[PDB]
Amino acid sequence: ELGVFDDMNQAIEAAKEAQLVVKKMSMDQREKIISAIRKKTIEHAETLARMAVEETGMGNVGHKILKHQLVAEKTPGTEDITTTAWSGDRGLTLVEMGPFGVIGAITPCTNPSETIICNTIGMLAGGNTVVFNPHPAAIKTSNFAVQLINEASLSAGGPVNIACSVRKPTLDSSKIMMSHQDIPLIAATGGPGVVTAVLQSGKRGIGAGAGNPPVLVDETADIRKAAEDIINGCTFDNNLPCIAEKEVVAIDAIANELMNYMVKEQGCYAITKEQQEKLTNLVITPKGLNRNCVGKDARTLLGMIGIDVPSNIRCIIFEGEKEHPLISEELMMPILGIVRAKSFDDAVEKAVWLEHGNRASAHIHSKNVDRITTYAKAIDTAILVKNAPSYAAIGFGGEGFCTFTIASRTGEGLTSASTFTKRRRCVMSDSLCIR
C-alpha cells in the first residue's frame, strides 16, 4: 500500500528522501501536486466518508463528504507561503518561511482523513513532507487517505512518499516518531493525552488540545436563526468536531423562545429529568465516555435508552445547571443542554466555566457590539463565531480558510502551511534598496 510501511523507521526514511526533492521543488510544482490532491479528495470524498463511518461507527456520510469538500476547496496551498521585505539605506532585509523537514503528525478518529489531507496540503506547500501515526480506530480510512495523496503526487510527476504512514499504528510506533532525530516538528491533533506527550518529546510540538465550546444567546439575538444555526452546528457530523457547539447558555428572557424554536423547527427532542438520568448513565460510564455512543445520531442515542422517536429527530436538548454532566462534559454527541442565565454577565461567567480554560472554541449570538466584545475578551478562545454555526470558523459559511488542526494549546491557532515553516532572515547589506 502506497506511502504505508511496516514500521515507523521505514516511514520516516521514505519521507525524508521525498523531502529532499520537495524542498527543491518550485511553488508551481508543489501547487500541481496540491491541485491533484484537492481533485483526488473531491472524487473520493464519498468513499472516504463512508469508510470513516463504517470503520469508526461515528459521524455520518453526508456531513463527512462536505467536510472533505471544505478541505479540498479551502485549505491554504502555496499562496499561504509569504515573504516580508524591509529596505532602506542599510539595504534589503528579507524574511522567508523555509521548510522544517519531515514533520510527524498524530491524527484523530473523528476527522481522520480530513486531518491527514489538510495537514499534507499545508505541509507540502511549505517544502515539508509528513509522516502519520493515525488513530488506530480509523487506520483504514487514514491510510486510504495517505494512499490517495501518493496517487495524486504520482499523477503530477512525483515524488512518491510525500505522505507516509504505518500499516499498524501502536504506542511503540508513536514513541519512535517522537524520539526520531530526523523529525524536528510534530503536529498533534487529538486529546490532551497525546498533545501533552508530544510537548515532552524534545521537539517542537504544535498542540491541538480539546474543548467544550459554549454558545451564548442573548436577548438581542435573532432567536429563530440562533436556533437553526446552533442545532446545525451542534449536530454536524453528529457533534464529532472539536469546534461544534456542545452546550448553550441562554439569557433567561428568550430561553423559552429559543428552545421552543429548537423543538418545533430544528428536530429537537426535549428530555425529562427522568430521561436525563438514564442517558447520563448510558453515555457516562465508570470507564469515562461511552465509545459506543460517541458520534451517534440522536435517534440512535434515544433508542439506546428505549426512547422511540421519529426519524426527523436529530438533537437531544434539555434545560440544566452548568454542572450537569451532559452539559459540563465534552461528549461529541448531538446532546445539547440549555443553561438559563439571569444576565449577560452571569451568562459570560457560566460560559467561561463551561469552556474549562481550554481557550479552544466558543460562540455567541448577539447583535450588540459591546456584548460581543465583552464575551470575546473574557472567553479568549482560539476561535469565536458570532451569529453563525460553529463550522463558519473553518470557512463553511464564514470568511477565512479551512483547517482541521486548531492549535489552541501551543497557540498557533488555525494551522496552515505557514505554521509549519521556519523563519529565515536574510540581510542584504547596503545593496538592493532601489529607491
Add this chain to the structure above:
Amino acid sequence: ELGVFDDMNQAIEAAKEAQLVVKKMSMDQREKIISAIRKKTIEHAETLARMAVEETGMGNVGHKILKHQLVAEKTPGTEDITTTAWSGDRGLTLVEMGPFGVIGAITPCTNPSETIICNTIGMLAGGNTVVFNPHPAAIKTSNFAVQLINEASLSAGGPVNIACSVRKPTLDSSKIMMSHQDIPLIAATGGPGVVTAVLQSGKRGIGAGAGNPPVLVDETADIRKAAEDIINGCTFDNNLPCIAEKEVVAIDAIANELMNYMVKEQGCYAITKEQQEKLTNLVITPKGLNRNCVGKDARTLLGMIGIDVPSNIRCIIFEGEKEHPLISEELMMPILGIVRAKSFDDAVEKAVWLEHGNRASAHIHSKNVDRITTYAKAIDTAILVKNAPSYAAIGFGGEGFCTFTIASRTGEGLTSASTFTKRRRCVMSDSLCIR
C-alpha cells in the same frame, strides 16, 4: 529587591497577579511602560555592562553598552502586535494576537540583561508578564535588569512585578517553572541542554539553540571591507554573541589578501602551528570548553599561553582545516581560523559542515547574486548576513529589529512581541463588510 523573590512559586504568583492588570491595559499604557524601560536601559547601560563584565569575567563594557542601546532603540514594542481582516459576503473575520499569560524565561550569562530586557519589552507588549530564571553566573546583573524594569513600570504608573526573578537561581527553581501550571510558554535562550529540557516540559518551548556561524568570502567580494566586517563582527563583545562569525571559509585565490588585510589593518595576530597547539590545549580542556577563556579578549588569551602582543591586537587568526578544533568548535573567543577552499562549491560544503546542522547563523561576502542564492539555499539558517558584520542581523547596521532570543531550533526565528502571543480568530458572520 524589586521583582526578585526568595523562590520561584512566589515569583510566578506575583507575575500572574500583575498579568491580570497587563492583559487589560491599553496599547498606550503598555507602550508607556515600555518607553520608560527603553529610557531606563539607556540611562543604566554603563552600569549593566560593567556589571556583566565584572560578574561573569566575560565580554567588554563598550560593546555591552552598544548592545543595550540596540535593545532599547530597536526591540519591537506594541506596533509589533498586529491584526488581519478578511471581509466579504459572509461578513468579517479578524485574527488577533492575544496574550499567553505568564511566560517563563531562561536566560544566558553572555547577554544576560540584554535578553531579559528584550524579552520583557516584547512580552509585555503582547499583554504577558514574564518570570526569569537567570544564569547563575550573571544573577546579579540579571536581577539588576529585573529591578530596573519594575523601577521603569513603577515610574509609569504601575504595575509592579511585570518581570519577576529569583534571588538564587538553581536547577530546582527552573524545574518548578517548567512544571508550573500557571506557565504555558517558556522561552529558552541558552545552550542545547536547557532548550532540550524546556521542550520536554509539557509546555510550548521557544528554543534558541546554539551555532558555529561561518562566514564565506569569495573572489567577487570587496576584500578589504570583508576583512573589516568579519573582525568587527567576530570580536564584538569578545565573540560572546551566538550570531558572531566564529570561523571563515575563503576562496583560495583571495584568501591571502583577506588574511593580509586582517593582520595589517584589523588588529589580527597570526599564530604558528606550534602556537595553535598550546592555545587548543588551553582553551579546550578534558572538561570541555575553558570557562576562564570564554569571552576573553585576544591579548588576554595570547598572554595566557605566554605570548606577549601589542594592545592593538584584538583577534587570533590562522589558516587551518575545518576539523581543527579552534575552527570546528564554538568557542565564544576572538579566535578565528581561515579555511582555504578550491571552489565556491567546495566553500559551500565546508561552510555547511562547520554550521553543524544548527540552521542558526551564517554569513557571506560576495557581490554575486547566484553565489549568495546558492549559499543561502544550502546553508538554510535562521540568519544570513551578506556583505556586513553579523550584528547587522539584529539591526546594528542592517534593516530590521533587534532581538536576543533567536529561536533557531523551534523555528520562530528572531523573536519579538508577536512570537509570544496566541492567535485568535473572530468570525463576524454576515455583518460588518461595509463594501
Add this chain to the structure above:
Amino acid sequence: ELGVFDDMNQAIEAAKEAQLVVKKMSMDQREKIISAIRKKTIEHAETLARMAVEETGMGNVGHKILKHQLVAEKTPGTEDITTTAWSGDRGLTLVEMGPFGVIGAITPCTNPSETIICNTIGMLAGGNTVVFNPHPAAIKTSNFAVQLINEASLSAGGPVNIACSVRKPTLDSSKIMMSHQDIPLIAATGGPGVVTAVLQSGKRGIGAGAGNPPVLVDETADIRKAAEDIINGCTFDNNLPCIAEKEVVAIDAIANELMNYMVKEQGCYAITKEQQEKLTNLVITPKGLNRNCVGKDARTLLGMIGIDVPSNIRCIIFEGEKEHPLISEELMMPILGIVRAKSFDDAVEKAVWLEHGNRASAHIHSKNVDRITTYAKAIDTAILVKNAPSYAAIGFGGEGFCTFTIASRTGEGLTSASTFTKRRRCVMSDSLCIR
C-alpha cells in the same frame, strides 16, 4: 522669510534642488528632519493656533492647539513607506514606493498650518519635497508653518527648502504650479472649485473634495453618550473641519431624549421657527455662505441675530426637514439641525440625501451590527465613524493615523506618505529566493 519666495517659479526651483538631496537621504535622515518638525510643531502650536484665529477670524485656539498636536503625534512618517516581496522558483520580485519629485499643494484657510505640516511630513517621508500655494486668507499662518519646517530641517542638518511657498498667493501663482513641468502631482485640499481645477491640470491630482457629514442615531444607541459625542464633534474648532458632524438624523422614538440631553448637558440652544429664519437670512446671503459667520462660535452667531445667551452655550440646535438650508448646506458653523425619521430605513435614506453624493464623511451611533453594516454599505463614504465623535476618524480617540488631506473625490482616502509615492516593481529573475 525661509522657504517663502517672491514667485512660484522660484518656489518650484528651490524645491526641485532640495528634492535632489531628499531623494538620496536615508530613512533615518528623513525621520530626523521629520522628528524635528514634530517637535517644532508642538513647541509652536499655541502660536500657530492664535495666528489662524487672528488672521482668518475662524475657529478657536484651544481646539487648534489640539489639532496641531494630533498632526505632530499621529501623522505617519517613514514607517509608512513599505515594501512587498514575492519570491519563488523564478526569483525575487520587489515592489517599492519611490518618490514623485516636487509635489504641488493647495491648502485651505480652515486647517491651514495643520494641512501644510501634515502634507510635508508625509511627502518628505517619501523622498519628495513640496511647494505650497496657501489660501490667501491664511497666508501668514501658512507661511509661518512653512518657515517653521525649514527651521526644523535646518536644525537637523538640512537641507533648506524642503517646503516652499510664495509671499503672495494668487490665481496666477496657482496656475503656474498647475502647468509647471517640474511638478507631476498636486494635492488639492479645498472646495470643489480648486479640486476640479487640479484634475484639469494634465497632472495627477489628489483631490480632497467637500462634504456634509450626517450623523445617524438609532434607538439602540447610548443616547447620553451620543449627545456628548455629536456636540463635541460638531463644535470642534467651531465646525471648520470637513469631517465634523453638520446635521443629525434621529430615529423618532429617541429623538427627544437626544435633543433634551443636548440642551441640558452639552451647551445647546434650541431655536424657534422664527429664530431659524433670521439665522438662515444671516448665514446664507445672496452671495452664498456668509464668510463673516463661517467658523464662529454659537454665542457669537446667536448674538449677531440679537439673541443673547449664556457663555456656556456652544451649539445652535433645532428640529427640521432635511431640505432646511441650515441642514442641507455645509456651513462650517456650530449649527446642528435634527431630522426626525420614521424608521432606520427612512433614516438611512435621509442621511444619504444629506451627504449629497460626496462619499466624504458620515457617522452613526448604533449598537447594532446589522444597522451599522446597512448604513455603511449605503452611505459609502471615505470615512465612517461609529459611536464616537467624528474626529476619531483622524486618530483623536480612534485607532489609525492622522491626516488633513482626505482624498474623497479621487479615492485615495486618508492621505499619508505612501499616497505620495510611485510604485516600482523590481524583478530579480531566477535568483535571491533563499528557500
Add this chain to the structure above:
Amino acid sequence: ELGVFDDMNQAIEAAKEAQLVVKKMSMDQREKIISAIRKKTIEHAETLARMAVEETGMGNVGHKILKHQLVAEKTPGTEDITTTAWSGDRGLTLVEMGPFGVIGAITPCTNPSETIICNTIGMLAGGNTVVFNPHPAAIKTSNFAVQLINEASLSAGGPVNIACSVRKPTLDSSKIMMSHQDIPLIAATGGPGVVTAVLQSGKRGIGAGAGNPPVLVDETADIRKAAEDIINGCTFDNNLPCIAEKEVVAIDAIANELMNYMVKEQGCYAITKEQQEKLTNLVITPKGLNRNCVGKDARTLLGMIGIDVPSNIRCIIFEGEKEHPLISEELMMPILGIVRAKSFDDAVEKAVWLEHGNRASAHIHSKNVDRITTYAKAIDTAILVKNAPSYAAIGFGGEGFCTFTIASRTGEGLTSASTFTKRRRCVMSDSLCIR
C-alpha cells in the same frame, strides 16, 4: 452585438445599471463571472490573436495567444481586494477598498483585447463596471473581446453589460466619456496624447504613458543568456509591448560577444551604415512613425528596403550612438541598436538619456548587486527586470501578476483590481478589540 452600443451615452447608462448589481454581488459571484472570463479568454485566444493581426496588421498570432493566456492565468481577481485592521483600546478601525462605479477606459491597438480583458477582470473584481472606447484600428478585435466578456457573464448567471463599448469609436465618443458625470475614473492605456487628455478631464485619470526601455549589459552578465533574453524580449509580438527592450547599452569589453551571440544563435541580422539609413528613411517619415512598419517582423522590414534574408531572421541589430533615431525613438519594431559604453557609469548615463525621463520600463543584465542597485536607483522606472526578458515584468517567467495597464505617469504602477477602488476607513470606537 453584446455590450456594444450605437453611442457612448447608451454604453455608459447600460454600464451604470449593471454596476448597481455588481456592487452588491458577493466576492464569490464576481469570482465566478471572472473565472468564466478567464476560461472564455483561453478558449478564444486563437481567434482574438488572429483578429488583431488581421485587423491591425501588427504583431503575430503565436505571441498574441500567449499574451491572452498570461492575462487569463495571472491577472489578479478578487483575492486582490484586501482589508486592513487596527485594533486597540479605542476599538477597531477597518480600511476597505470600495468600488468607484462606472470606470471609463481607453485602450490601444497593440494589445487591444488583452487590455480590455485585463482591465475588466480587475475592475469587476472591485465592484466596478467599465466602458471602453477602443482604438479605432482594433475596434473589431476590441468589441469581440467585449462581447466575449458579456458571453462569459451571461454564462455565470449575469448580469449583462459589465463591459460596454461603442460600435464606432471616435474622438466625439471619447470626449463624451471624459465629460460624463456618471464616470469618476478613467484608465488611459495609450500614448501621451490620450493620457494627457484624460488628466485634463476633471476626473481622476490613471495614466499609462509611453517609454523606450533600455537594457543594460555589463561584463558580469551571463552573455549568452543575455543575448537570448534580450532578443526574445525585444521580438515578442514584434516589439509591440510597451515594456519590451527597444535598445541595448553594452559595456564595451563584452559588446562583441553579446552581438556575436545575437547573430549566431538568436536570428539577428546586422545592418551596415548604408542599410541603416534606408531603414531610418523607411520607418521614420516626415509624418513621424511609419504605421505600415509598426509591429512588423524583421524579415518583412528588411524586405521592404529590398534586403532579402532567411526566414530564420527575427531581429535587425546594429551598433550606433544613442542619438541614432532607430535607437533613440520608440519604434515598436524588432529593430535593436547596441550602444557601446566605456564604463558602467557611462552605461548608466546613456541608458538614462535613452529612457527619456519616462520612468516606464528598463532592464539590466548583471550578476553584481551594487551594479543593479546603482542602475535601479538612477533609472527609477515603474519596472525593472534583472537578468530576464522584459515580459518577466508581467509574470511571464517572473514572480508577480500580469497587467497590461502600467500606470507609469500617474504612479500606480502595474494596475490591478486594487488600483480601481476607493479607500474607506471605518472606525468602530471602543468596541470589537477582542484582545
